Amino acid sequence: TKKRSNNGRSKKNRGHTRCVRCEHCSAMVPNDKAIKKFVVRSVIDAASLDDLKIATIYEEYEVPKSYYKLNYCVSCAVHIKLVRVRSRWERKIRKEQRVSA
Amino acid sequence: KDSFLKKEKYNLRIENFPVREVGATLVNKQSTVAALEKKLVGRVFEANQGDITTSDSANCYRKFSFKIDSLAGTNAHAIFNGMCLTSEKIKGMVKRGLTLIEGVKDVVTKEGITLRILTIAQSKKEKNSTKKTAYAKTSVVKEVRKNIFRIVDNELNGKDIEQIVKKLQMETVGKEIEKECQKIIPLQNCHVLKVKVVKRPVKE
Amino acid sequence: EQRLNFALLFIKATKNDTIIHATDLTGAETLAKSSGGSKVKAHRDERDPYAAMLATQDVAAVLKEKGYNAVHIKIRGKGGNQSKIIGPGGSTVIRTMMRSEFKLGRVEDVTPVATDSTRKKGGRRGRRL
RNA sequence: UAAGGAGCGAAGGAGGGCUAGAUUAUUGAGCAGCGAGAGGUGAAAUUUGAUGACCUGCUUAGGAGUAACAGAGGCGAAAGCGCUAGUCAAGAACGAAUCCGAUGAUCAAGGACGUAGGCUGGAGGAUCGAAGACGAUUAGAGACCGUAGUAGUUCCAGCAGUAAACGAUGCCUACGCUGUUGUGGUUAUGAGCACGGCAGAAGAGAAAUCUAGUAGGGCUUUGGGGAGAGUACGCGCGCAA
Ligand SMILES: [K+]
Ligand SMILES: [K+]
Ligand SMILES: [K+]
Ligand SMILES: [K+]
Ligand SMILES: [K+]
Ligand SMILES: [K+]
Ligand SMILES: [K+]
Ligand SMILES: [K+]
Ligand SMILES: [K+]
Ligand SMILES: [K+]
Ligand SMILES: [K+]
Ligand SMILES: [K+]
Ligand SMILES: [K+]
Ligand SMILES: [K+]
Ligand SMILES: [K+]
Ligand SMILES: [K+]
Ligand SMILES: [K+]
Ligand SMILES: [Mg+2]
Ligand SMILES: [Mg+2]
Ligand SMILES: [Mg+2]
Ligand SMILES: [Mg+2]
Ligand SMILES: [Mg+2]
Ligand SMILES: [Mg+2]
Ligand SMILES: [Mg+2]
Ligand SMILES: [Mg+2]
Ligand SMILES: [Zn+2]
């Protein structure tokens, strides 16, 4: 029986879409189906900022950040616990997740 | 056999900026001036605008590149070789719900050097407005891009390198673009993204 | 008192290993070089924060001998069509250099990103485990 | 004619063919610096390095691709289509006092297109990798994992004719409740027209749910308990498959 109204993907009014590759296992997954995750990570860890304050030559310094978008296939997303199995009424709830660091 | 002992330091010098001397580089000692030329000439380095100027700590997002050209005693003299924005700036600028506008153009200095320029701009969401996204229509993007090319042609084509370098320092092209193109659509983050030297004329 | 005598330090930090390498400002002359795998025995430890830290100290020592005082840092992962997150160990090289006496200039992420790319290894199904 | 075709005006789109350019990246060679390991995994071995690897510079040579922006967004008959300029035909929608007047719906036979993999000839050959060969793991692995490696993967001129080619829902044409959110034009600024998404309701249905409500409107395809069987014989296409 049909488990989801949208077939588990975001394609509508189209024939075909570009593929992308999974970060964890390099499998091909369609772009409109892949699980997506955003990361904004400081170059320097929080446990070093108190040393940075005496190491730097400049009057003040702003740490550089690094930015990423990651893609996962279903198997990897479930195994890494980005997503979890949910009850028949919960399946319908849609909410934006946090940006990781 | 401590080869490090047998090395000569030389000081790097630059022009058209507030700070003249920027560091020093090693070479193995050699008998003949022809050898030292062939070893030092052709080397390259890069420096942040914040290091070679006295300036607001905000201006750290840009780097300049120089190629070694000539030797005189202790000093190596080096010439302009390109400009680049820092990775943090490029990556941090792009945001969801807005359009990027991008362009590539070629120009010729009076000195005969040919340069290739990359340019970027972003659309902006107006105040007192409630729609979630502020994308730009594809035909409108072509109007902005058409304008950008005449601005770059007016500002930089057929000039000296001494003039170009100061225009890049003061960020005049970005400022002109934001002024000129406002009539088409509102924009933000207008910048020259990269400058690359393509051909240098065969000269003595 | 003294002026700041600067060197470049390059750092590569993958899932498998970490490589540390100091040069003149031109990048065309080498002052000192080490890796996590140089110091440790077991292959599974070459990425270890500990092996990175041991390997950094040797590099810091040779630079202090050659008379350097200050450092600019350019750091990367593997990039290309492969992984582009900085690996473990990368962020401990930097903190170690600060416990040694060195003054830090500027830090930059210089991972090679591709505007589009050649085909990645692994086939259409990917690794099965 | 809230039937069709021809035409006018302003505009929109990863629709298609061609010409000329582009920022990086992955490999390969040259040269320079340094002097011991690199790679790969859950953990390791094949393997490569003093004929100087790895990593960092500068030069070059090729052949693919267009990241992030990028979406329950757009375009196309479907298959499918994402860098920038210039060029060549035709189409859809919208606005309105343009022209002709039944020119129309659906369709055996017959004709044109059709991802990928495959085949016939030419160009080329970076990356990836059927077959084949090793290293491990196992009672045994011929497999999964790692090293390596060929046909193919790209282009031009053709053949072939299959897909879970699926929203598993034929094509025209009707009658039908509300709220919300998009895309492109137009606007007495109140709204409409075309193409969508979403959430309830009422009916319906074995339920799950709703392209499924109401109904002797028109036309084509198609099923009749499991198996044997989409197989045998004959016939038609194809170089073969
Ligand atoms: K399909
Ligand atoms: K999904
Ligand atoms: K390892
Ligand atoms: K080792
Ligand atoms: K060892
Ligand atoms: K065209
Ligand atoms: K084909
Ligand atoms: K085999
Ligand atoms: K065996
Ligand atoms: K294998
Ligand atoms: K391979
Ligand atoms: K055909
Ligand atoms: K045919
Ligand atoms: K069929
Ligand atoms: K449609
Ligand atoms: K039914
Ligand atoms: K038969
Ligand atoms: Mg099931
Ligand atoms: Mg498993
Ligand atoms: Mg070598
Ligand atoms: Mg792009
Ligand atoms: Mg028409
Ligand atoms: Mg083929
Ligand atoms: Mg039909
Ligand atoms: Mg039967
Ligand atoms: Zn995966």
XYZ file of C-alpha atoms (C1' of nucleotides) and ligand atoms in Angstrom:
701
model
C 0.000 0.000 0.000
C 1.021 3.628 -0.664
C 2.847 4.930 2.441
C 3.254 8.660 1.578
C 1.185 11.054 -0.572
C 4.312 12.666 -2.094
C 6.143 9.334 -2.773
C 8.887 10.423 -0.317
C 10.260 13.188 -2.620
C 9.646 16.836 -3.581
C 9.355 16.447 -7.423
C 6.077 17.796 -8.952
C 5.318 18.964 -12.563
C 8.682 17.567 -13.817
C 10.014 14.495 -15.597
C 13.601 14.240 -14.298
C 16.114 15.879 -11.906
C 19.882 16.109 -11.291
C 21.564 13.518 -9.028
C 23.997 14.185 -6.139
C 26.392 11.913 -4.173
C 26.056 10.835 -0.511
C 28.719 12.250 1.895
C 29.061 8.975 3.812
C 29.069 6.265 1.076
C 29.117 8.086 -2.336
C 25.804 6.506 -3.513
C 23.800 8.452 -6.125
C 20.554 10.033 -4.844
C 18.106 12.423 -6.680
C 18.496 16.048 -5.536
C 14.753 16.424 -4.722
C 14.868 13.317 -2.411
C 18.278 13.660 -0.612
C 18.389 14.552 3.135
C 20.143 17.950 3.492
C 22.163 19.371 6.401
C 23.741 22.834 6.889
C 26.918 23.506 8.915
C 28.602 26.733 10.075
C 31.754 25.844 12.025
C 34.428 28.173 13.463
C 37.980 27.452 12.240
C 39.098 27.712 15.919
C 37.543 25.697 18.785
C 35.866 27.383 21.788
C 38.546 25.901 24.114
C 41.272 28.060 22.412
C 39.657 31.546 22.220
C 41.177 32.462 25.624
C 44.688 31.738 24.230
C 43.909 33.525 20.931
C 43.385 36.720 22.980
C 47.108 36.683 23.986
C 48.560 35.056 20.814
C 47.199 37.505 18.152
C 49.212 40.551 16.961
C 46.078 42.603 16.049
C 44.143 44.953 18.394
C 41.025 42.773 17.930
C 40.380 39.658 15.823
C 37.298 37.945 14.392
C 37.661 34.179 13.942
C 36.992 32.916 10.370
C 34.022 30.548 9.932
C 33.653 27.643 7.456
C 30.421 26.827 5.629
C 29.040 23.525 4.283
C 25.959 21.901 2.785
C 25.962 18.096 3.185
C 23.783 15.507 1.410
C 22.776 12.042 2.645
C 20.981 9.012 1.236
C 18.082 7.490 3.266
C 20.135 4.569 4.691
C 22.937 6.842 5.927
C 20.558 9.480 7.389
C 18.718 6.770 9.416
C 21.977 5.077 10.535
C 23.721 8.357 11.545
C 20.434 9.330 13.337
C 19.727 12.578 11.463
C 16.150 11.206 11.098
C 14.133 8.548 12.988
C 11.069 6.329 12.454
C 7.798 8.039 13.503
C 4.129 7.112 14.125
C 1.363 7.283 11.446
C 0.114 10.701 12.662
C 3.599 12.184 13.340
C 4.792 11.424 9.742
C 2.805 14.452 8.490
C 4.536 17.111 10.673
C 7.048 19.309 8.732
C 9.508 21.641 10.624
C 12.925 23.170 9.764
C 15.924 21.748 11.703
C 18.802 23.777 13.260
C 22.041 24.721 11.459
C 24.911 22.655 12.984
C 28.330 23.874 14.270
C 75.803 19.211 6.761
C 73.570 22.138 7.751
C 72.632 23.572 4.324
C 70.522 26.239 6.092
C 73.749 28.052 7.065
C 74.563 28.660 3.372
C 71.537 30.796 2.446
C 71.087 34.476 1.580
C 68.081 36.569 2.676
C 66.706 39.373 0.455
C 64.010 41.941 1.265
C 60.775 42.169 -0.730
C 59.734 45.703 -1.836
C 56.416 46.904 -3.366
C 54.888 50.103 -4.894
C 51.635 52.176 -4.893
C 50.771 51.265 -1.276
C 51.476 52.946 2.136
C 53.846 50.160 3.325
C 57.007 49.605 1.234
C 58.606 46.466 2.743
C 56.740 43.283 3.558
C 59.239 40.497 4.368
C 62.279 38.511 3.166
C 63.053 35.291 1.228
C 65.901 32.740 1.196
C 68.090 31.320 -1.613
C 71.217 29.125 -1.659
C 74.345 31.273 -2.144
C 75.542 31.542 -5.780
C 78.611 32.911 -7.585
C 77.030 34.592 -10.596
C 74.368 37.370 -10.789
C 72.780 35.570 -13.788
C 72.088 32.554 -11.551
C 70.535 34.670 -8.768
C 68.246 36.401 -11.286
C 67.111 33.026 -12.700
C 66.441 31.770 -9.133
C 64.584 34.776 -7.614
C 62.768 36.254 -10.618
C 59.440 34.507 -11.244
C 58.596 33.894 -7.572
C 55.238 35.082 -6.139
C 53.680 36.118 -2.810
C 50.384 37.449 -1.419
C 49.504 40.005 1.241
C 46.274 41.107 2.929
C 45.140 44.718 2.429
C 45.079 45.085 6.227
C 48.813 44.346 6.457
C 50.044 46.726 3.708
C 47.802 49.689 4.701
C 46.746 51.666 7.798
C 43.019 51.154 7.790
C 39.730 50.026 9.353
C 39.911 46.428 10.644
C 36.821 45.756 8.443
C 38.897 45.849 5.210
C 40.579 42.470 5.917
C 38.513 40.679 3.252
C 40.888 41.357 0.296
C 44.312 40.070 -0.856
C 46.866 41.389 -3.380
C 49.421 39.349 -5.304
C 52.921 40.317 -6.496
C 55.546 38.787 -8.837
C 59.355 39.283 -8.345
C 60.774 41.371 -11.189
C 64.217 42.906 -10.447
C 67.217 42.660 -8.052
C 69.262 45.486 -6.488
C 71.625 44.605 -3.648
C 69.617 43.539 -0.588
C 66.290 44.229 -2.289
C 63.969 42.426 -4.676
C 61.351 44.597 -6.420
C 57.922 43.120 -7.219
C 54.976 44.089 -9.454
C 51.146 43.783 -9.332
C 49.857 40.364 -10.385
C 46.195 40.218 -9.268
C 43.544 40.730 -6.594
C 41.289 38.266 -4.725
C 38.552 38.276 -2.021
C 38.966 35.970 0.981
C 37.032 32.687 1.117
C 35.104 33.662 4.276
C 33.665 36.674 2.431
C 32.551 34.829 -0.727
C 30.973 31.923 1.164
C 29.364 34.084 3.861
C 27.708 36.403 1.331
C 25.434 33.845 -0.406
C 21.962 33.444 1.199
C 18.714 31.541 0.411
C 15.765 33.424 -1.124
C 17.932 35.892 -3.162
C 19.463 35.936 -6.680
C 23.195 36.125 -7.561
C 24.290 38.167 -10.622
C 27.731 37.306 -12.090
C 29.927 38.540 -14.979
C 33.322 38.111 -16.729
C 35.070 40.809 -18.828
C 38.498 41.419 -20.460
C 40.325 44.803 -20.533
C 43.644 46.254 -21.808
C 45.968 48.614 -19.915
C 47.833 51.490 -21.633
C 50.985 49.577 -20.620
C 49.726 46.676 -22.813
C 48.954 44.093 -20.071
C 45.608 42.296 -20.549
C 43.419 41.689 -17.489
C 40.364 39.511 -16.824
C 37.855 40.745 -14.218
C 35.132 38.804 -12.317
C 32.205 40.693 -10.737
C 29.342 39.808 -8.333
C 26.104 41.377 -7.037
C 23.067 40.165 -5.045
C 19.360 41.151 -5.060
C 17.823 42.794 -1.967
C 14.442 42.434 -0.217
C 12.688 45.806 0.247
C 11.177 47.024 3.556
C 7.396 47.191 4.226
C 6.984 43.968 2.188
C 5.759 40.534 3.273
C 6.701 38.011 0.546
C 9.345 35.518 1.782
C 11.673 35.725 -1.267
C 13.142 38.513 -3.402
C 14.336 36.748 -6.562
C 15.136 38.711 -9.735
C 13.518 37.967 -13.111
C 15.859 36.490 -15.747
C 15.383 39.287 -18.303
C 16.048 41.942 -15.599
C 19.314 40.205 -14.672
C 20.461 40.768 -18.279
C 19.771 44.523 -17.899
C 22.001 44.737 -14.799
C 24.770 42.674 -16.401
C 24.689 44.829 -19.535
C 25.170 47.937 -17.330
C 28.019 46.380 -15.298
C 30.086 45.859 -18.465
C 29.875 49.544 -19.538
C 30.849 50.634 -15.998
C 33.940 48.381 -15.990
C 34.872 49.563 -19.510
C 34.584 53.220 -18.455
C 36.547 52.775 -15.209
C 39.519 50.557 -16.114
C 40.088 50.221 -19.882
C 43.179 51.975 -21.316
C 44.477 53.188 -17.898
C 47.864 52.739 -16.149
C 48.489 50.088 -13.482
C 49.281 52.843 -10.979
C 45.707 54.120 -11.526
C 44.051 50.679 -11.503
C 45.657 49.682 -8.190
C 44.229 52.739 -6.372
C 40.753 52.167 -7.841
C 40.893 48.614 -6.458
C 42.091 49.898 -3.041
C 39.273 52.459 -2.710
C 36.593 50.045 -4.073
C 35.248 52.577 -6.593
C 33.718 50.052 -9.038
C 31.406 48.466 -6.427
C 30.219 51.942 -5.354
C 29.544 53.036 -8.939
C 27.554 49.854 -9.682
C 25.252 50.299 -6.654
C 24.628 53.912 -7.686
C 23.990 53.233 -11.397
C 21.858 50.064 -11.319
C 19.442 51.045 -8.488
C 16.937 52.214 -11.169
C 16.605 48.647 -12.524
C 16.286 46.841 -9.154
C 17.628 47.193 -5.560
C 21.005 45.455 -5.071
C 23.533 44.674 -2.320
C 27.102 43.271 -1.905
C 28.455 44.678 -5.215
C 32.171 43.786 -5.533
C 35.013 43.015 -7.899
C 35.600 39.381 -7.015
C 38.902 38.557 -8.755
C 41.449 40.192 -11.097
C 43.740 37.971 -13.191
C 46.665 38.847 -15.488
C 46.351 36.978 -18.780
C 49.111 38.272 -21.115
C 52.148 40.435 -20.377
C 53.772 42.041 -23.490
C 57.231 40.922 -24.622
C 59.307 43.849 -23.324
C 62.895 44.640 -22.242
C 61.188 44.936 21.204
C 61.992 42.727 18.174
C 60.122 42.874 14.857
C 57.857 39.961 13.918
C 59.778 37.526 11.703
C 56.981 35.615 9.882
C 56.788 32.141 8.271
C 53.936 30.338 6.498
C 52.516 27.141 7.978
C 50.435 24.779 5.779
C 48.165 22.153 7.401
C 46.385 19.246 5.705
C 43.846 17.324 7.785
C 42.124 14.281 6.274
C 40.369 11.280 7.846
C 43.595 9.212 7.541
C 46.543 11.546 8.415
C 47.788 15.076 9.213
C 50.670 16.881 7.465
C 52.374 20.048 8.840
C 54.865 22.075 6.712
C 56.596 25.498 7.258
C 57.926 27.718 4.437
C 59.121 31.224 3.555
C 56.461 33.779 2.454
C 57.108 32.814 -1.187
C 56.196 29.137 -0.536
C 59.316 28.286 -2.603
C 61.649 27.416 0.316
C 61.003 24.816 3.074
C 62.024 25.271 6.764
C 60.489 22.191 8.548
C 58.005 19.323 7.949
C 56.260 16.549 9.949
C 53.238 14.238 9.962
C 51.103 12.355 12.486
C 52.327 9.054 11.022
C 55.981 10.036 11.637
C 55.637 9.870 15.445
C 53.017 7.145 16.133
C 53.184 3.335 15.587
C 49.597 2.082 14.948
C 47.937 3.049 11.635
C 44.615 3.854 13.348
C 46.260 6.699 15.346
C 47.724 8.790 12.492
C 44.605 11.067 12.552
C 44.627 11.194 16.400
C 44.617 14.645 18.109
C 47.553 13.286 20.146
C 49.713 12.343 17.137
C 49.003 15.780 15.592
C 50.124 17.450 18.842
C 53.415 15.474 19.130
C 54.216 16.198 15.453
C 53.548 19.959 15.898
C 56.110 20.305 18.734
C 59.022 19.074 16.582
C 58.130 21.665 13.897
C 57.871 24.445 16.534
C 61.346 23.508 17.859
C 63.127 23.633 14.471
C 61.501 27.025 13.735
C 62.727 28.437 17.079
C 66.250 27.229 16.145
C 66.115 28.937 12.692
C 65.016 32.095 14.549
C 61.325 32.546 13.652
C 58.755 34.239 15.907
C 55.407 34.601 14.113
C 53.255 32.553 11.737
C 50.446 32.750 9.168
C 48.234 29.632 8.881
C 46.586 28.216 5.727
C 44.464 25.101 6.451
C 42.632 22.530 4.276
C 40.813 19.214 3.847
C 40.979 17.036 0.716
C 38.408 18.789 -1.533
C 38.127 18.225 -5.298
C 35.295 15.714 -5.719
C 36.042 14.173 -2.276
C 35.309 15.232 1.329
C 35.635 18.931 2.200
C 35.325 18.969 6.000
C 38.572 19.620 7.954
C 39.559 16.331 9.651
C 40.328 15.640 13.370
C 43.693 16.955 14.503
C 43.618 20.087 12.290
C 42.338 22.339 15.092
C 44.891 20.974 17.631
C 47.917 21.942 15.488
C 46.819 25.602 15.837
C 46.216 25.529 19.639
C 49.619 23.835 20.164
C 51.456 26.555 18.205
C 49.922 29.093 20.645
C 51.170 27.197 23.751
C 54.618 27.433 22.216
C 55.610 31.092 22.188
C 54.608 31.975 18.582
C 52.490 35.009 17.669
C 49.629 34.225 15.281
C 49.035 36.452 12.250
C 46.145 35.377 10.006
C 44.145 32.136 9.506
C 42.530 31.096 6.183
C 40.564 28.080 4.904
C 42.027 27.170 1.498
C 40.255 23.904 0.596
C 40.052 23.366 -3.243
C 36.379 23.563 -4.202
C 35.254 22.715 -7.769
C 32.687 24.730 -9.763
C 31.750 21.380 -11.289
C 33.634 18.121 -11.275
C 34.768 14.761 -12.622
C 32.971 11.602 -11.442
C 33.601 10.418 -7.847
C 34.764 6.920 -6.862
C 32.355 4.374 -5.416
C 29.849 3.401 -8.120
C 26.122 4.127 -8.259
C 25.264 2.067 -5.146
C 28.152 3.208 -2.957
C 30.139 1.322 -0.282
C 28.144 -1.479 1.421
C 28.948 -2.168 5.092
C -19.892 29.565 -29.351
C -16.531 30.001 -22.040
C -16.165 25.291 -31.122
C -11.674 25.713 -34.367
C -7.944 28.009 -37.649
C -5.423 32.823 -39.618
C -3.563 37.531 -37.748
C -2.241 42.176 -34.329
C 0.066 44.480 -29.602
C 3.239 44.481 -25.184
C 5.829 40.973 -22.473
C 7.789 36.027 -19.960
C 10.633 30.793 -19.726
C 17.256 25.200 -17.532
C 12.132 24.578 -24.785
C 15.438 23.460 -29.355
C 19.751 23.953 -33.381
C 24.438 26.828 -34.466
C 28.988 30.369 -33.720
C 32.496 32.404 -30.333
C 34.444 32.783 -25.383
C 35.007 31.498 -19.427
C 36.231 30.748 -13.273
C 37.847 26.455 -10.749
C 38.690 21.118 -10.242
C 40.821 15.738 -11.387
C 44.896 13.409 -13.895
C 49.885 13.444 -16.768
C 54.669 15.521 -17.744
C 58.979 19.412 -16.912
C 61.839 22.013 -13.351
C 62.910 23.781 -7.957
C 62.839 23.207 -2.482
C 62.866 19.149 1.885
C 64.956 14.293 3.280
C 61.164 9.674 5.356
C 57.375 7.722 4.895
C 52.556 7.814 1.927
C 47.793 5.250 0.744
C 43.568 2.492 2.545
C 40.042 0.440 6.553
C 35.734 -1.543 11.570
C 40.807 -3.354 12.013
C 44.622 -4.627 8.326
C 47.299 -6.620 3.997
C 48.230 -6.394 -1.484
C 50.603 -1.858 -3.221
C 54.069 2.464 -3.947
C 59.101 5.550 -1.952
C 66.697 7.328 -1.605
C 65.934 6.080 -10.152
C 63.873 11.411 -3.917
C 57.791 9.644 -2.783
C 54.305 12.868 0.242
C 53.669 18.184 0.773
C 54.727 23.490 -1.129
C 56.215 26.606 -5.617
C 56.242 27.998 -10.818
C 55.389 26.225 -16.141
C 52.638 23.582 -19.437
C 49.053 19.244 -22.234
C 44.551 17.248 -22.702
C 39.398 15.472 -22.237
C 34.720 15.674 -19.223
C 31.650 18.883 -16.355
C 28.761 23.450 -14.904
C 29.039 23.363 -7.068
C 26.999 26.818 -3.489
C 22.331 30.260 -5.339
C 18.420 25.878 -6.120
C 12.719 25.595 -4.039
C 6.471 20.397 -3.003
C 10.194 26.903 -8.430
C 9.967 27.244 -14.232
C 9.864 25.093 -19.482
C 8.688 20.857 -23.022
C 4.133 15.902 -26.762
C 6.673 12.447 -23.804
C 11.775 10.778 -23.254
C 14.105 15.162 -21.069
C 16.360 20.496 -20.125
C 20.980 24.467 -15.206
C 28.178 29.116 -17.162
C 28.294 33.927 -20.619
C 27.379 36.587 -25.156
C 25.598 36.725 -30.493
C 22.405 34.351 -34.258
C 18.048 31.149 -36.697
C 12.954 29.148 -37.045
C 8.361 27.799 -34.947
C 5.002 27.238 -30.457
C 1.997 28.263 -25.393
C -0.472 31.996 -22.456
C -2.583 37.227 -21.798
C -5.155 42.108 -23.668
C -8.769 43.900 -27.239
C -15.355 46.487 -31.128
C -9.245 42.221 -36.465
C -10.546 38.299 -40.523
C -12.722 33.471 -42.471
C -17.283 30.287 -41.334
C -18.151 24.434 -39.694
C -13.314 23.918 -41.486
C -14.379 19.708 -35.724
C -13.775 14.832 -31.430
C -11.592 10.013 -31.245
C -8.935 6.590 -33.957
C -7.667 -0.298 -36.852
C -3.969 0.145 -41.181
C 0.128 3.443 -42.191
C 4.030 7.118 -40.644
C 7.647 10.276 -36.985
C 10.193 10.803 -31.828
C 11.870 7.505 -27.610
C 16.678 7.673 -20.671
C 20.099 3.888 -20.268
C 22.676 -0.332 -21.788
C 23.882 -2.626 -26.916
C 25.495 -2.823 -32.346
C 27.968 -0.648 -37.588
C 31.653 2.935 -39.278
C 34.821 7.361 -38.434
C 37.211 11.115 -34.420
C 39.278 11.035 -29.674
C 40.564 9.131 -24.567
C 41.153 13.257 -18.274
C 37.794 10.769 -14.503
C 34.975 6.421 -13.428
C 34.775 1.296 -14.339
C 31.363 -4.644 -16.569
C 35.048 -8.728 -17.845
C 39.763 -10.437 -16.203
C 43.827 -10.562 -12.050
C 45.400 -10.077 -6.927
C 45.281 -8.943 -1.285
C 42.219 -9.940 3.071
C 37.599 -12.305 5.665
C 35.447 -17.191 6.013
C 34.033 -24.312 6.685
C 34.089 -22.511 1.669
C 33.832 -17.348 -0.915
C 33.768 -17.756 -6.576
C 30.873 -12.042 -3.619
C 30.439 -7.884 -0.154
C 35.993 -4.554 1.391
C 40.992 -2.789 -0.603
C 44.779 -2.601 -4.879
C 44.869 -2.426 -9.864
C 42.751 -2.977 -14.892
C 39.999 -3.526 -20.249
C 35.148 -2.833 -23.260
C 32.338 1.022 -22.517
C 31.362 6.223 -20.394
C 32.398 11.863 -24.891
C 31.572 13.600 -30.216
C 29.607 13.001 -35.800
C 26.541 9.684 -39.338
C 23.063 5.691 -38.652
C 20.503 0.845 -36.747
C 17.661 -0.888 -32.653
C 12.642 -0.139 -29.843
C 12.716 -2.082 -24.231
C 12.006 0.234 -18.455
C 8.570 0.388 -11.337
C 8.858 4.722 -19.719
C 4.416 5.402 -12.394
C 0.944 10.637 -9.893
C 1.021 2.244 -10.965
C -5.042 6.887 -12.422
C -6.673 7.205 -21.516
C -8.437 11.672 -24.651
C -12.137 15.554 -25.520
C -16.368 17.982 -23.060
C -19.650 19.066 -18.421
C -21.745 20.081 -13.333
C -19.815 20.962 -8.771
C -17.821 23.813 -0.812
C -14.314 26.814 1.800
C -9.667 28.759 3.508
C -4.517 29.549 2.407
C 0.115 29.884 -0.505
C 2.755 30.312 -5.445
C 4.202 31.541 -11.195
C 3.096 34.944 -15.720
C 0.273 38.802 -17.936
C -4.033 42.457 -17.074
C -6.659 45.699 -13.815
C -12.857 50.321 -11.905
C -7.090 48.196 -7.217
C -12.578 45.558 -5.758
C -10.651 41.493 -8.815
C -10.094 38.150 -12.935
C -7.705 34.529 -16.879
C -4.039 30.285 -17.661
C -0.846 26.802 -15.054
C 0.054 24.775 -9.903
C 0.908 23.314 -4.311
C -1.545 22.700 0.514
C -5.397 22.062 4.471
C -10.161 20.780 5.940
C -15.697 19.583 4.603
C -19.638 16.885 2.093
C -20.343 12.715 -0.653
C -18.015 8.056 -2.173
C -15.484 3.374 -1.226
C -14.100 -3.584 1.284
C -10.865 -0.597 3.621
C -6.373 2.287 3.037
C -7.775 6.787 1.144
C -9.626 10.342 -2.784
C -6.825 11.915 -10.421
C -11.811 7.766 -6.839
C -17.990 13.344 -5.866
C -22.637 13.655 -9.634
C -24.225 11.142 -14.736
C -27.608 5.818 -20.423
C -22.512 12.591 -23.307
C -19.049 10.911 -27.421
C -14.671 7.682 -29.229
C -10.337 4.106 -28.769
C -7.350 0.431 -25.653
C -8.176 -3.617 -22.149
C -9.397 -7.968 -17.779
C -12.630 -12.650 -16.718
C -9.792 -18.530 -10.249
C -4.383 -20.302 -9.586
C -0.473 -22.847 -12.692
C 1.635 -24.409 -17.533
C 2.597 -19.211 -20.299
C 3.701 -14.227 -22.478
C 5.870 -20.450 -23.560
C 5.278 -24.030 -28.674
C 4.227 -23.785 -34.185
C 3.574 -20.372 -38.254
C 4.366 -15.238 -39.867
C 6.489 -9.815 -39.986
C 10.641 -6.575 -38.927
C 16.389 -6.340 -37.313
C 23.658 -6.725 -39.089
C 23.067 -9.263 -34.490
C 21.298 -8.946 -29.619
K 10.868 8.936 -15.307
K 12.612 13.291 1.697
K 45.572 5.633 8.852
K 54.239 5.245 10.648
K 57.591 3.840 11.901
K 19.329 29.835 -28.542
K 21.098 5.701 -26.891
K 35.916 -10.462 -10.253
K 41.734 -16.569 -1.125
K 35.432 -5.615 -6.045
K 40.528 3.018 -10.012
K 14.948 5.756 -34.771
K 11.640 3.352 -35.377
K 5.658 -2.629 -21.687
K 0.687 20.836 -17.283
K -12.024 0.670 -7.474
K 8.600 -18.118 -31.165
Mg 5.854 -2.784 2.887
Mg 23.789 -2.153 6.590
Mg 60.623 15.792 -7.135
Mg 26.971 27.817 -11.646
Mg -0.647 30.847 -31.012
Mg 26.553 4.391 -25.948
Mg -5.352 7.420 -26.702
Mg -6.841 -16.836 -15.338
Zn 24.967 6.939 1.935
